[PDB]
From a paper:
The kcat/Km values of LlGH31_u1 against kojibiose and maltose were 13% and 2.1% of that against nigerose, indicating that LlGH31_u1 has a higher specificity to the α-1,3 linkage of nigerose than other characterized GH31 enzymes, including eukaryotic enzymes. Furthermore, the three-dimensional structures of LlGH31_u1 determined using X-ray crystallography and cryogenic electron microscopy revealed that LlGH31_u1 forms a hexamer and has a C-terminal domain comprising four α-helices, suggesting that it contributes to hexamerization. Finally, crystal structures in complex with nigerooligosaccharides and kojibiose along with mutational analysis revealed the active site residues involved in substrate recognition in this enzyme.
Crystal forms 1 and 2 belong to the space groups P21 and P6322, respectively, and comprise six and one molecule of LlGH31_u1, respectively, in an asymmetric unit. With molecular assembly in the crystal structures, LlGH31_u1 probably forms a hexamer.
Numbering used by the authors:
A (entry chain A): 7 to 739
B (entry chain B): 12 to 132
The structure:
């Protein structure tokens, strides 16, 4: 059969597939046979036919779409024979791709891990570029129909040219169509996780879980780190106790009972797995694995780690994990730090995440793993696990940027160790700022090193820090409805929960100049504080870009007239999070109560414009509509759910059942936030002279005209104090 | 008896803790001294072998040395030491650097003001 889809062009030894007007597959084959199989990266090349034009001559071909000219001059792919011009003017002369060459503009993607990183590390390129094109090489192995490694591609060069311009959201959508959508997360993954590299007993671990309840901190996940298994008692002839599959019965004399007690507390349970030293002769499962793999047990022959080997994988899932799953382990923390070597040339991290994520689905519907990034397409195996960050202001300052930038390669479920993993320095404010970021990150998992000094328990800290941490951990559970809805949107529509500003505001230069600022779902904009407070102000700060429109602090209702770039100041207990006029945010009214789905939703409405919110749940869709001051709630299915409505400052309706409409036009649109209260608070906490406090309070109270209030603060000899006062006068204008 | 051949490789267990590893395309292995090596006469030692169709394992009191056949690559030739001095730096891979080397020396201190890099010992 000579039949070919109309989107396929062949010329010399190349094949071009025009998958969209802005996405061209580029293949080279010595043999004239081109690759149809799935690869590690690509799952789907079925794209609806698109319009394009060809200029084919003897010696050259040009493929022309709405956004790109692709040229091929025959022969081997070199920087001279294969190149493209984009039909954009985002740069004066960075509008040409050359095969095998780097161009500027790439907005970056992510990397394997933050292991041993103190602050910034280099990132790999993503598919997003300010100049409108990027090339995603497919260097992976081909897969069989059922998803096992098949060997080398017959397309010895296989590339994807993205030429979406600054339509970043559409580039990511089409990347997901190509590599497969992110699977749905389960709701439990979006709550708080407790983890610590600490040799807990059953007793001490349950006592901690019960103290979390006593302290009014909700948790969804109980992580148990490597001290669950034998460590120091492993005979040295076998190597270290890092890898283990055998319970420490001194700490866990009845593992199934312990896991059942965590299940009764509605916690999902994961164990640390260090797979690299395989199954050695001292292990509980060794007799059964040695039988299956026909090992020499009198010579203590180990079942060495080999995820290329179908029999090893089968032994690993059925005979090593299987018994631990039967005891009640819900999902696996794959903790691989042992390199990228295999006989197949496939990264063992890729093999682990691919096969473990598939195996997890027998255990539970929409199950997860926790593992490091395994390259483009590995978003199919959530969750991401960033690993052994250094505990530092510099590490925190990198992390929001790292997180939002990862959306540029579709890896949208990074779980960082909140408060940082190891080394570095103690600073309770650092631990608190890091938790603020974690709550507004894809996953909020508390974790720490083996130190006796790095517990992330709120009560480790003083009464102020402890209370603020408890408040933020409660907030995480309030946000689960919003997070779970955004999760179902990632899985169904290919939209990241965390977006860089330039996704919404691609033509605004300031959207590229606030590296740690992001959109958090569709209704909230976050600007985490990631530097130690100024002790004179007793407040930290971040420069915020406010896009055009009216914005409100999500917590205080402090207003801000966009478009402006404004330095904003917050006490260590407060975080900069903002909503536009018209925003509607659902909150669980009962974040401490372990309900499978919330019995009551708070609808938090920001007055001053129309808005809309769709709450996706396991078995329902709930639409909130705010049009000409009328707030309406409707659902796909009937339910007993109670709805609370908070319109700006004020609870209007409490615990109303069913679908309803309510006219909010006759209700107070204004937040209580006011200039005079906020000014008094900022002056009162500041470690400045009382004479300065007195004069600033007197003059700003006395001076009526806003421009002369600003002139007065402009004379202040403390420059950061001027900025803080300016923020208040700007919100109060 | 201290000598084992497998595929295109020759292993010589000189001590319980010292193993020569040779590759030869032709199956001819080198007996002559080199600039570095002057003597390969060492007393017999005890060690075990697990030889299969496609793989060999040599086991001493201190090391597992594995060879999976073919040219020597990081994947085909590697070893686990029977020690627990590190949590996961106990594996040698052919042609890869691992941590822990306490260093050796270098040709000269010509033009060196303070420290210079040393070669591995
Ligand atoms: O299992 C011990 C490890 O050091 C873990 O605590 C880290 O989180 C792994 O990255």
């Amino acid at each position: 059969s000579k039949y070919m889809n109309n989107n396929i062009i062949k010329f010399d030894k190349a094949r071009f597939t025009v998958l969209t007007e802005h996405l061209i597959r580029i293949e080279y084959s010595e043999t004239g046979e081109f690759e149809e199989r799935m690869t590690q990266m690509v799952q789907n090349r079925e794209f609806s036919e698109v319009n394009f034009d060809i200029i084919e001559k003897e010696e050259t071909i040009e493929i022309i779409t709405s956004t790109v000219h692709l040229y091929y001059n025959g022969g081997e792919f070199t920087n001279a024979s294969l190149f493209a011009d984009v039909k954009f003017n985002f740069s004066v002369y960075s509008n040409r791709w050359y095969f095998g060459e780097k161009s500027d503009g790439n907005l970056k993607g992510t990397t394997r891990t933050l292991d041993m990183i103190d602050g910034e590390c280099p990132l790999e390129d993503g598919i997003m570029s300010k100049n409108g094109f990027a090339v995603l090489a497919d260097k992976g192995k081909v897969l069989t129909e059922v998803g096992d490694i098949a060997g080398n591609s017959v397309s010895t060069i296989d590339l994807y040219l993205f030429a979406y311009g600054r339509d970043y959201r559409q580039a990511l959508k089409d990347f997901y169509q190509l590599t497969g959508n992110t699977p749905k997360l389960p709701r439990f993954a979006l709550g708080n996780w407790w983890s610590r590299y600490y040799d807990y007993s059953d007793k001490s671990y349950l006592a901690l879980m019960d103290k979390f309840t006593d302290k009014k901190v909700p948790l969804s996940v109980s992580v148990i780190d490597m001290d669950w298994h034998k460590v120091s008692e492993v005979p040295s002839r076998f190597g270290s106790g890092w890898t283990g599959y055998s319970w420490n019965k001194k700490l866990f004399p009845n593992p199934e009972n312990f896991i059942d007690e965590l299940h009764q507390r509605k916690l999902k349970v994961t164990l640390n797995d260090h797979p690299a030293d395989g199954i050695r002769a001292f292990e509980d499962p060794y007799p059964q694995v040695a039988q299956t793999l026909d090992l020499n047990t009198e010579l203590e022959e180990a079942a060495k780690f080999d995820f290329d080997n179908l029999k090893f994988r089968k032994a690993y899932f059925e005979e090593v994990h299987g018994p631990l799953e039967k005891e009640g382990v819900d999902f696996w923390w794959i903790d691989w730090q042992q390199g990228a070597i295999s006989k197949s040339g496939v990264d063992p991290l890729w093999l682990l995440n691919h096969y473990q994520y598939q195996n997890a689905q027998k255990k539970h519907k929409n199950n997860i793993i926790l593992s490091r990034y395994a390259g483009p397409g590995s978003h199919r195996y959530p969750l991401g696990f960033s690993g052994d960050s250094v505990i530092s202001w510099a590490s925190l300052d990198f992390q929001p940027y790292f997180t939002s930038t990862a959306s540029n390669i579709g890896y949208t479920w990074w779980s960082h160790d909140i408060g940082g993993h190891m080394q570095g320095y103690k600073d309770a404010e650092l631990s608190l700022r890091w938790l603020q970021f974690g709550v507004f990150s894809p996953i909020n998992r508390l974790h720490s090193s083996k130190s006796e000094f790095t517990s992330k328990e709120p009560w480790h800290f003083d009464a102020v820090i402890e209370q603020s941490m408890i408040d933020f951990l409660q907030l995480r559970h309030q946000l689960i409805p919003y997070l779970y809805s955004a999760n179902l949107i990632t899985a169904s529509e290919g939209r990241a929960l965390v977006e860089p500003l330039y996704y919404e505001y691609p033509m605004e230069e300031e959207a590229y100049q606030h590296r740690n600022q992001y959109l958090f779902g569709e209704q909230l904009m976050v600007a985490p504080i990631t530097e130690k407070m100024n002790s004179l102000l007793q407040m930290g700060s971040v420069e915020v870009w406010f896009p055009e429109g009216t914005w409100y602090d999500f917590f205080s209702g402090q207003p801000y007239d966009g478009k402006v770039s404004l330095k904003v100041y917050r006490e260590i207990t407060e975080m900069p999070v903002f909503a536009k006029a018209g925003a509607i945010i659902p909150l669980d009214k009962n974040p401490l109560k372990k309900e499978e789905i919330p019995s009551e939703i708070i609808w938090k409405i920001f007055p001053g414009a129309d808005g809309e919110y769709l709450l996706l749940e396991e078995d329902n869709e709930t639409k909130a509509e705010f049009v000409n001051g009328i707030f309406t709630v409707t659902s796909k299915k009937e339910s007993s759910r109670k709805h609370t409505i908070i319109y700006g400052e004020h609870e209007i309706v409490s615990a109303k059942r069913g679908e309803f409409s309510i006219d909010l036009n006759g209700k107070e649109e204004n937040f209580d936030w006011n200039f005079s209260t906020a000014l008094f608070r900022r002056l009162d906490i500041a470690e400045i002279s009382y004479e300065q406090k007195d004069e600033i309070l007197q003059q700003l109270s006395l001076i009526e005209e806003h421009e002369k209030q600003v002139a007065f603060i402009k004379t202040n000899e403390n420059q950061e104090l001027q900025n803080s006062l300016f923020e208040l006068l700007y919100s109060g204008k």
